Amino acid sequence: GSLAFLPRKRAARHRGRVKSFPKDDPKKPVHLTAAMGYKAGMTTIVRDLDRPGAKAHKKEVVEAVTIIDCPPMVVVGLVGYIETPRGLRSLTTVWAEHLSDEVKRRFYKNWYKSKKKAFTKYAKKYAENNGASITRELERIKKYCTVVRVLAHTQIRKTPLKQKKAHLMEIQINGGSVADKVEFGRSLFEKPVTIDTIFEKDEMIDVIAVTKGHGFVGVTARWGTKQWTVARAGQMGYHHRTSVNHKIYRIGKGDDEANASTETDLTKKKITPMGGFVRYGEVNNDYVMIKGSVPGVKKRIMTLRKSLFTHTSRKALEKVELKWIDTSSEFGHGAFQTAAEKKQFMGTLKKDLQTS
Amino acid sequence: LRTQKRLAASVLGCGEGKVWLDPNEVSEISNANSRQSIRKLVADGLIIKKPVTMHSRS
Amino acid sequence: IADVVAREYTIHLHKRLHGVTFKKRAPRAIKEIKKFAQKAMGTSDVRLDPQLNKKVWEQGIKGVPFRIRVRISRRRNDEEGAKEKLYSYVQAVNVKNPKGLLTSVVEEE
RNA sequence: CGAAAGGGUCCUGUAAGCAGUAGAGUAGCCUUGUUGUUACGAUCUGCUGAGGGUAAGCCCUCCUUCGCCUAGAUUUC
RNA sequence: CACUGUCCCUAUCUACUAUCUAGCGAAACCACAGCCAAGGGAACGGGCUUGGCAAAAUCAGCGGGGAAAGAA
RNA sequence: UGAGCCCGGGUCGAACGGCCUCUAGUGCAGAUCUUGGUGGUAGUAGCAAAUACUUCAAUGAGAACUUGAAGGACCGAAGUG
RNA sequence: GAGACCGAUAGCGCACAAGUAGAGUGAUCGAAAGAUGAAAAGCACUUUGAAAAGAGGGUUAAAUAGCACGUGAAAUUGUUGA
């Protein structure tokens, strides 16, 4: 196997970290650089290809795409960083008032019996003098910090998971003076940010998650055979992987009610498969359609971030046009996209006649 | 009640698989230690010999 | 809310005996019924009817029915210095089909 | 939150029973049968894409029903 | 001439173990010990030199070391 | 100097020592020593095959492997008689 | 009748219900094992426990002599103290 992923141990945290934000220049406009979502599953699409030089040019190609459910992240914080000879140091974290109970669940291991007193005194310094402690801490970021980040969390009630604990993550602001991005961060407090605003269609993005765990296995499957370099048994899976150059094929709204409808098939249907996603449920929010395979199991939190470098391929500058999206049953050999055309194909059944 | 199961087999002339003891009268069976005390409980209905199993030839 | 209450339930043993070794399904179904009445009535002292044990073992050791329908009766254990003050008795009931039947409380009167 | 139920989605392939001289064939009645009757009867057809199963690592629940819940032990600046 | 996991190239399923618990419960073996590298004339280190280093207590795998020709 | 000698404190209960000579089965770390006892290994290796057990009640301080009854299996007259 | 002998791993294999127990088809081979106290006065009675036993109380000069019994080393072990 590769010696680059040599410490084949379990990932230290379930969420998995970005480890590198894009290099920042002040001439760019102010923008965020990452987001979070939940893995729903995969489907099948047909894309009308426009690849000059390809054998499938101006033809129909069937591709596998991955659906990531993206409820709108809520911005709750702002973290400033300074440059050091020892590295990079966090100087000041500024939160907001009216923190939701979802992110408050994150700072507790037993929420059901706690007194829920987190950030109770922090809510009082917003009205202590006039907010002097809050404004002082922001001015400390403006005059001393070299780059600032945004604390945003996802909501689990919009997602069909039995979890109630939100996922809290730091997202870097790029493209501007430190004064400009701080005024973004304070203005963005208590506000939902959609995936329509962070990313866009036809864009390579970077996907970060923890892979599927397989427990203790031997050298037959852990290494792929017939000190560190010697193939030895141990843990396979639950490793942190950063994947590169995955195209955003679609960004659904969730309100639209015709998410799986294209300009060529005029069927008013959504992205959720007929019968539901297996072991996930229904996607009722914004979703991101990612081409190809993507790490992590279903229901797992997905971290999407911008590409670090300017792209060097025509695959990134390709406009994607979808002809149709599969919506048939994941639970078997489904030959029906919607409920309506199954009853149209089948005809009247016995239970339908007895009920009516 | 192993002694009573063995003695009832000799009194009734069958095997121990056909001797049936009353589940609700275990205290009365326990006091029966003679072949005359068991012959009491056979007549009273507390110890009963089961019939032959059905062996339908049809 | 009463200590003495009798209700009738349906146990989906098909989902509780999925993938089990064939020679342990009838013994495990007994333990899953005991685990069912312990959770549904809060009583660790659970007694099963001998005729309920007949219903479980009706089709052999590997032929437990998918759905059994029973009545669980919480009664007061009087005894003399008992470890627990309540117990649940479980009996199989006679129905045409153990499907489509909701959980219901049966009135003694 | 849990157990059932309902609906959905899949898997198999048309349940038990009832009925039609469609029905090869097997037999009793009286007498010539050119259209004689009376019973049983494999098989076929219909009720019946019915019936069964369905999360155990599938999905949803409009008062779908029933139940549970501010437990109790230890440790800590 | 026909088939075949022999192989390309491997995947999957079952039972008993391996795992954990209750009870019961040995033996082999044992100077003292167990991280490496260079040097330690007698091609001989594990204890010396001088470097790399070096942080309690533990649970599972392994197949390396703690083993080996003798010279006409 | 040393092999050793002497005293204090605790335990214990019936005999013992200094000095000069006499006498010997007289001084131990080794003998893959002899006999006896005790460790680490170690609460570790392990506690098989003969398909298989389950429910209620009784006895009892205590019941998977004790009994009664009821289910599920077996020997199958060349028997597990 | 005695000894410049030995003193329970010694002295006969045997200080003891020792040529016993045990082993071998058999000829034969063949152990280990002494000591409360002057006197059993060898715990009356009470209490906990199913019992074994434990705690009070008592016997004795001594239970730091409980018939796992005089004195009670070392290996090895436990608790407390550093």
PDB file of N, CA, C and O (backbone and C1' of nucleotides) in Angstrom, chain E residues 35-48:
ATOM      1  P     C E  35      15.992  -3.019  26.297  1.00  0.00           P
ATOM      2  O5'   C E  35      15.883  -2.731  24.741  1.00  0.00           O
ATOM      3  C5'   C E  35      14.690  -2.995  24.026  1.00  0.00           C
ATOM      4  C4'   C E  35      14.679  -2.213  22.744  1.00  0.00           C
ATOM      5  C3'   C E  35      15.958  -2.313  21.934  1.00  0.00           C
ATOM      6  O3'   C E  35      15.994  -3.463  21.113  1.00  0.00           O
ATOM      7  C1'   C E  35      15.360  -0.045  22.176  1.00  0.00           C
ATOM      8  P     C E  36      17.361  -3.902  20.407  1.00  0.00           P
ATOM      9  O5'   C E  36      17.410  -3.003  19.099  1.00  0.00           O
ATOM     10  C5'   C E  36      18.649  -2.669  18.508  1.00  0.00           C
ATOM     11  C4'   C E  36      18.595  -1.348  17.789  1.00  0.00           C
ATOM     12  C3'   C E  36      19.929  -0.891  17.235  1.00  0.00           C
ATOM     13  O3'   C E  36      20.213  -1.484  15.984  1.00  0.00           O
ATOM     14  C1'   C E  36      18.923   0.890  18.416  1.00  0.00           C
ATOM     15  P     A E  37      21.577  -2.287  15.767  1.00  0.00           P
ATOM     16  O5'   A E  37      22.576  -1.174  15.237  1.00  0.00           O
ATOM     17  C5'   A E  37      22.214  -0.352  14.141  1.00  0.00           C
ATOM     18  C4'   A E  37      23.034   0.910  14.102  1.00  0.00           C
ATOM     19  C3'   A E  37      24.531   0.740  14.286  1.00  0.00           C
ATOM     20  O3'   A E  37      25.184   0.340  13.095  1.00  0.00           O
ATOM     21  C1'   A E  37      23.759   2.522  15.632  1.00  0.00           C
ATOM     22  P     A E  38      26.375  -0.729  13.142  1.00  0.00           P
ATOM     23  O5'   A E  38      27.654   0.135  13.523  1.00  0.00           O
ATOM     24  C5'   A E  38      28.127   1.151  12.657  1.00  0.00           C
ATOM     25  C4'   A E  38      29.130   2.037  13.346  1.00  0.00           C
ATOM     26  C3'   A E  38      30.274   1.333  14.056  1.00  0.00           C
ATOM     27  O3'   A E  38      31.312   0.934  13.183  1.00  0.00           O
ATOM     28  C1'   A E  38      29.366   2.963  15.484  1.00  0.00           C
ATOM     29  P     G E  39      32.074  -0.455  13.430  1.00  0.00           P
ATOM     30  O5'   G E  39      32.945  -0.198  14.732  1.00  0.00           O
ATOM     31  C5'   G E  39      33.990   0.756  14.727  1.00  0.00           C
ATOM     32  C4'   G E  39      34.494   1.037  16.118  1.00  0.00           C
ATOM     33  C3'   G E  39      35.125  -0.127  16.850  1.00  0.00           C
ATOM     34  O3'   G E  39      36.452  -0.367  16.425  1.00  0.00           O
ATOM     35  C1'   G E  39      33.687   1.060  18.311  1.00  0.00           C
ATOM     36  P     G E  40      37.165  -1.759  16.761  1.00  0.00           P
ATOM     37  O5'   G E  40      37.553  -1.616  18.292  1.00  0.00           O
ATOM     38  C5'   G E  40      37.865  -2.760  19.055  1.00  0.00           C
ATOM     39  C4'   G E  40      37.394  -2.645  20.476  1.00  0.00           C
ATOM     40  C3'   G E  40      37.197  -3.972  21.178  1.00  0.00           C
ATOM     41  O3'   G E  40      38.408  -4.532  21.641  1.00  0.00           O
ATOM     42  C1'   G E  40      35.312  -2.617  21.550  1.00  0.00           C
ATOM     43  P     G E  41      38.869  -5.970  21.109  1.00  0.00           P
ATOM     44  O5'   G E  41      39.104  -5.774  19.548  1.00  0.00           O
ATOM     45  C5'   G E  41      40.367  -5.354  19.048  1.00  0.00           C
ATOM     46  C4'   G E  41      40.728  -6.028  17.746  1.00  0.00           C
ATOM     47  C3'   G E  41      40.787  -7.549  17.787  1.00  0.00           C
ATOM     48  O3'   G E  41      40.544  -8.060  16.482  1.00  0.00           O
ATOM     49  C1'   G E  41      42.944  -6.696  17.376  1.00  0.00           C
ATOM     50  P     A E  42      39.301  -9.031  16.204  1.00  0.00           P
ATOM     51  O5'   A E  42      39.740 -10.422  16.838  1.00  0.00           O
ATOM     52  C5'   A E  42      40.609 -11.302  16.141  1.00  0.00           C
ATOM     53  C4'   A E  42      41.027 -12.461  17.009  1.00  0.00           C
ATOM     54  C3'   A E  42      39.901 -13.232  17.678  1.00  0.00           C
ATOM     55  O3'   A E  42      39.341 -14.205  16.813  1.00  0.00           O
ATOM     56  C1'   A E  42      41.617 -12.772  19.252  1.00  0.00           C
ATOM     57  P     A E  43      37.793 -14.615  16.920  1.00  0.00           P
ATOM     58  O5'   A E  43      37.024 -13.404  16.235  1.00  0.00           O
ATOM     59  C5'   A E  43      37.286 -13.043  14.888  1.00  0.00           C
ATOM     60  C4'   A E  43      36.190 -12.173  14.331  1.00  0.00           C
ATOM     61  C3'   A E  43      34.980 -12.897  13.765  1.00  0.00           C
ATOM     62  O3'   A E  43      34.069 -13.250  14.788  1.00  0.00           O
ATOM     63  C1'   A E  43      35.636 -11.098  12.337  1.00  0.00           C
ATOM     64  P     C E  44      33.176 -14.579  14.688  1.00  0.00           P
ATOM     65  O5'   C E  44      32.426 -14.611  16.091  1.00  0.00           O
ATOM     66  C5'   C E  44      31.797 -13.442  16.592  1.00  0.00           C
ATOM     67  C4'   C E  44      31.662 -13.470  18.093  1.00  0.00           C
ATOM     68  C3'   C E  44      31.094 -12.209  18.722  1.00  0.00           C
ATOM     69  O3'   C E  44      29.680 -12.156  18.653  1.00  0.00           O
ATOM     70  C1'   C E  44      33.008 -12.906  19.928  1.00  0.00           C
ATOM     71  P     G E  45      28.941 -10.863  18.054  1.00  0.00           P
ATOM     72  O5'   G E  45      28.013 -10.380  19.250  1.00  0.00           O
ATOM     73  C5'   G E  45      28.552 -10.248  20.559  1.00  0.00           C
ATOM     74  C4'   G E  45      27.485 -10.050  21.600  1.00  0.00           C
ATOM     75  C3'   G E  45      26.794  -8.695  21.557  1.00  0.00           C
ATOM     76  O3'   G E  45      25.464  -8.828  22.051  1.00  0.00           O
ATOM     77  C1'   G E  45      27.971  -8.915  23.593  1.00  0.00           C
ATOM     78  P     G E  46      24.286  -7.928  21.435  1.00  0.00           P
ATOM     79  O5'   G E  46      23.831  -7.000  22.648  1.00  0.00           O
ATOM     80  C5'   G E  46      22.946  -7.495  23.645  1.00  0.00           C
ATOM     81  C4'   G E  46      23.165  -6.832  24.981  1.00  0.00           C
ATOM     82  C3'   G E  46      24.618  -6.604  25.363  1.00  0.00           C
ATOM     83  O3'   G E  46      24.658  -5.522  26.289  1.00  0.00           O
ATOM     84  C1'   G E  46      23.667  -8.114  26.879  1.00  0.00           C
ATOM     85  P     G E  47      25.712  -4.326  26.127  1.00  0.00           P
ATOM     86  O5'   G E  47      26.082  -3.963  27.630  1.00  0.00           O
ATOM     87  C5'   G E  47      25.070  -3.556  28.544  1.00  0.00           C
ATOM     88  C4'   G E  47      25.542  -3.598  29.977  1.00  0.00           C
ATOM     89  C3'   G E  47      27.016  -3.274  30.195  1.00  0.00           C
ATOM     90  O3'   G E  47      27.161  -2.509  31.390  1.00  0.00           O
ATOM     91  C1'   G E  47      26.533  -5.421  31.072  1.00  0.00           C
ATOM     92  P     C E  48      27.276  -0.907  31.319  1.00  0.00           P
ATOM     93  O5'   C E  48      28.730  -0.650  30.730  1.00  0.00           O
ATOM     94  C5'   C E  48      29.873  -0.763  31.558  1.00  0.00           C
ATOM     95  C4'   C E  48      31.138  -0.479  30.794  1.00  0.00           C
ATOM     96  C3'   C E  48      31.115   0.756  29.912  1.00  0.00           C
ATOM     97  O3'   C E  48      31.360   1.950  30.637  1.00  0.00           O
ATOM     98  C1'   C E  48      32.024  -1.067  28.705  1.00  0.00           C
TER      99        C E  48
END
